[PDB]
Design a binder for these strands. Structure first.
Lengths: 26, 167, 56, 154, 256
RNA sequence: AAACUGCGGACGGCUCAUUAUAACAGUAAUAGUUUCUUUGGUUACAAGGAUAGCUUUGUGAAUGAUAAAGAUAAUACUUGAGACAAUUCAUUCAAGUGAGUUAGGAUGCCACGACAAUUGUAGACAAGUAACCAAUGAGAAUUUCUGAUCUAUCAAUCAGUUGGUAGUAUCGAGGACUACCAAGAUUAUAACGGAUAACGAGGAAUUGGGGUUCGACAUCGGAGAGGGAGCUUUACAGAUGGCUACCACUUCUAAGGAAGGCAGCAGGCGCGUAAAUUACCCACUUUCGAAUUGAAGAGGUAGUGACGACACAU
RNA sequence: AUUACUUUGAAUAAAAUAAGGUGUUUAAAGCAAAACAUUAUGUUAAUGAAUAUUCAAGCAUGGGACAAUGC
């Protein structure tokens, strides 16, 4: 579990919202 | 053992250098392995800090890259034809960096047939001769005595003329 | 007397005994020269379960 | 053509093919790589226009220029791509409260970008990685000086 | 010297520990971790000397191996754990929280904190690089590696950490109008407002800072640690409030 | 309990023989390398043999000596699903930094390949493990600049020597080594030699100022374990309270053979004008370890002590 | 335009030297103890001397008289 998306989805939670404030860039 | 310290040399003034300590593992060298051409023979060497170096004693195959066509293929090595450092490396077929070697362009020819629909057996003229003669010129770009493999590239226009005239 | 350190981590109270002349441990007692005043340091180990646990 | 005088083929550290007029990589030529070093040093025009090849030149290679920086006068220019720089300084002797003249010789690497560098010129050098047993510096700029009927160029 | 050294002689210990020169022949070498050997205070030093909860190294072990001391939000059982800067120190058995802050006497002093303000921490960014896969991360003076940060988080700034969750709460830009507490040389513990930042192309950046009482001094950019923005601090300064009394006052106030 | 496995004995302790730009001190660089520990992160309802302690039979005068057979475990050794990372090469798009075809992305290829087939019923929580980033790391290692005692009855020294190219080796730069090429490098501002009853520094004695002499020895750095040399294990050793060979010794012996290195703490012989107990304990400081507990001639206490320093009787 | 000179600093291990406080009964010492709060309370989150050095180099800064190389 921990491994199983309990962590891994974070690594897609974390990733995703990053590309948000990388795209403002204004 | 073989040492790489500068305490056994002479100063820039030519004066002899006296001794204060003994040999130490920090400046330790190892016996060179002259990678010849033949059946695959590699050894694992424990270096400092536990890392492992692949000592290739003998090799026959290698991965070579064609810059113009943006491909890399495995190929059997035929002969070593030019070594810019020592001529004795030519006779013994020693595999080192920058050694111009001769390989059979069989996989490259087959790739050309499947991709263009043509056979090679604009490109520089000497490259075609290597294709029809079955021996193309390539330069080794890896360090076989350290990485344990022969990685290289097929010679091309300006590099080919310089190295072909040397032979 | 003198100062108090409340030390629940070691389950202990410690004071500097100032003499103007099992839970108790006394250490480092010396008088002043010429008699009279005597000083020292005391060890309140309260419950008799720390004294054994927290005692060399 | 004139720089290929050795047994091996001389190439730059970073050699890349330029794009042709049609917008694709042209394998028939190689871009002349040239970088700019740091603290207020201009790249000589020879490092841009020139066709020489050197793997220790600070302008056309991956050798960096680190903190230490000195200056001096060229002493000898007999060795290939290397010169000897002499620094004259004063050493203070505390007991006599007087200075004494001293000198030290530094073997530095002179890239072929500086073609007009001769003996007696004033040279600014910078410190790089060890490039030889003794050569641990590199010439960054130079100024010509008076002549002594012996124009010994690099 | 065939390998790493494990002992630390007392005289070679960092000066601001103030270990008595006749107490013993050795000093507690701080185990590697977040903070450097000379920018840290070992946990044994804090308990035995600064707080007197233990009288020797034997009794420091009993306190720490009882699982009773929390560094940051985590609980550490290493007797020689390196506690350096404002990294919080919580003792829940005694219901008290301290913050390891500097002072004008180039010393580590424990600043008391409330429970609500012991749940946060300020970290100074040290570098920001692109990781593998174009994943940016920042490295703080504490030594934490933090995943995808705000793009404005540059090298020399300061960030506020939420200890219980590890998130980023507030960030302060390293500009020329913000408070800073020095951590390096002669300015150790001094607090002022940045007024000038001159750069030399080769060696170092030297920062001119004006003290709250009008005094001015200079330090290297390495020692600068931004505390807050616009003369307003995000943390509670020690008793001296980052003001160095110029000698005569300190001597006279000690006489009184 | 013993034993397999893991960690440690590369720290600490002693000595100053070697050493004349060597080492060391301040300084600066590593965009020319980098472990171990610790810290922050990231990436089948369970398989296979054999081995010790164990039992049995033994040899040798004997060592920390050793032979056979019969079993038996793994976080020891392997295979194996759980689904990337990191290396080399070739081409290419390129932003911080004083400065980088640089961190980074893309294409193709080779090798490598996972997050124990793991552990507490009790003090899900733990705990453990493999790689990769980063810190620890102003650490280690190389390197830059400046700085040493006497001597010219030591004036010329050097041939891997000085540089270049290509390669090799190394963790890595580098004549560190190899092949080819060129003739270079240092010197009256003292090179090359010779001496030292020479480890360097912080410092010590004496001094109105300037200075002179000393520094084996608290602490930092270097080197060594009777003399060289060569290696094993490992993250770190050219380790010597590790091994191999030669030289010089010492001890046991059943005469066949065998180990040992007090410049560790006590102590003994010799030497000299010249220098202390074959004591007790881990309670202080701290180090190591599977860890709150075990060890520590490190460390502490005690004994000898007109080397010296302070107060004080008649 | 550099260098030298000079003024301020930055940065720089302690021990030691100088020097600040402190009745080890004085003193050599130690960096602790208390002065008073008659002291748990509080001075108190108590002292750590600013502890200064420091030469020959290296880095930055204000001045350019006396000097060297300018070109």
């Amino acid at each position: 579990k921990l491994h199983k998306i309990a962590m891994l989805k974070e690594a897609k939670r974390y990733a995703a919202i990053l590309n948000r404030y990388k795209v403002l860039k204004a | 053992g073989i040492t790489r310290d500068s305490r056994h040399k002479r100063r820039a003034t030519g004066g002899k250098k006296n001794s204060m300590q003994k040999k130490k593992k920090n400046t330790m060298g190892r016996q060179p392995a002259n990678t010849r051409l033949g059946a695959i023979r590699v050894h694992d060497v424990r270096c400092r800090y536990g890392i492992i170096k692949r000592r290739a004693l003998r090799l026959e195959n290698g991965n070579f890259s064609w810059a113009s066509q943006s491909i890399t293929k495995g190929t059997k090595i035929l002969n070593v034809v030019y070594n810019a450092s020592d001529n004795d490396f030519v006779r013994t077929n020693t595999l080192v960096k920058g050694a111009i070697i001769e390989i059979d362009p069989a996989p490259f020819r087959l790739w050309f047939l499947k991709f263009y629909g043509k056979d090679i057996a604009k490109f520089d003229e000497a490259l075609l001769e290597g294709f029809q003669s079955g021996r193309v010129l390539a330069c080794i770009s890896s360090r076989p005595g350290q990485t344990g493999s022969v990685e290289g590239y097929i010679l091309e226009g300006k590099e080919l003329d310089f190295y072909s005239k040397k032979i | 007397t003198r100062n108090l350190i409340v030390n629940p981590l070691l389950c202990r109270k410690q004071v500097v005994v100032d003499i103007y002349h099992q839970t108790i441990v006394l250490n480092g007692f010396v008088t002043k020269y010429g008699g009279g005043k005597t000083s020292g340091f005391a060890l309140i180990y309260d419950t008799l379960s720390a004294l054994k646990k927290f005692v060399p | 053509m004139a720089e290929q005088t050795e047994r091996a083929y001389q190439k730059q550290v970073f050699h890349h093919h330029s794009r042709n007029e049609k917008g694709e990589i042209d394998f028939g030529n190689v871009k002349r790589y040239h970088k700019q070093i740091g603290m207020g040093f201009v790249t000589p025009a020879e490092a841009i226009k020139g066709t020489y090849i050197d793997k220790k030149c600070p302008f056309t290679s991956d050798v960096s220029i680190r903190g230490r920086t000195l200056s001096g006068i060229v002493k000898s220019c007999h060795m290939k791509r290397t010169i000897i720089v002499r620094r004259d300084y004063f050493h203070y002797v505390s007991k006599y409260q007087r200075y004494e003249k001293r000198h030290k010789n530094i073997a530095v690497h002179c890239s072929p970008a500086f073609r007009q560098l001769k003996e007696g010129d004033h040279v600014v050098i910078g410190q790089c990685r060890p490039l030889s047993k003794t050569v641990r510096f590199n010439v960054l700029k130079f100024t010509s000086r008076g002549t002594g009927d012996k124009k010994q160029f690099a | 010297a065939r390998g790493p050294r494990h002992h630390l002689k007392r005289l070679n210990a960092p000066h601001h520990w103030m270990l008595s020169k006749l107490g013993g022949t050795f000093a507690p070498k701080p185990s590697h971790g977040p903070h450097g050997m000379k920018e840290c205070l070992p946990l044994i030093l804090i308990l035995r000397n600064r707080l007197n909860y233990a009288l020797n190294g034997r009794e420091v072990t009993m306190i720490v191996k009882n699982r009773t001391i929390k560094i940051d939000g985590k609980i550490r059982t290493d007797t020689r754990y390196p506690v350096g800067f404002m990294d919080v120190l919580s003792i829940p058995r005694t219901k008290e929280n301290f913050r390891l802050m500097y002072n004008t006497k180039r010393r580590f002093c424990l600043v008391p904190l409330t429970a609500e303000q012991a749940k946060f921490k300020l970290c100074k960014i040290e570098k920001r690089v692109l990781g593998t896969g174009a994943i940016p991360y920042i490295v703080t003076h504490d030594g934490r590696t933090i995943r995808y940060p705000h793009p404005e988080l540059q090298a020399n700034d300061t960030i506020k950490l939420n200890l219980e969750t590890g998130k980023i709460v507030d960030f302060v830009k390293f500009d020329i109008g913000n408070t800073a507490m020095m951590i390096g040389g002669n300015g150790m513990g001094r607090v002022g407002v940045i007024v000038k930042r001159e750069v030399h192309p080769g060696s170092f950046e030297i920062v001119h800072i004006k003290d709250a009482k009008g005094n001015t001094f200079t330090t290297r950019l390495n020692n600068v640690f931004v505390i807050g923005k616009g003369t307003e601090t995000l943390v509670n300064l020690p008793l001296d409030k980052g003001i160095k009394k110029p000698l005569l006052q300190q001597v006279n106030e000690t006489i009184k």
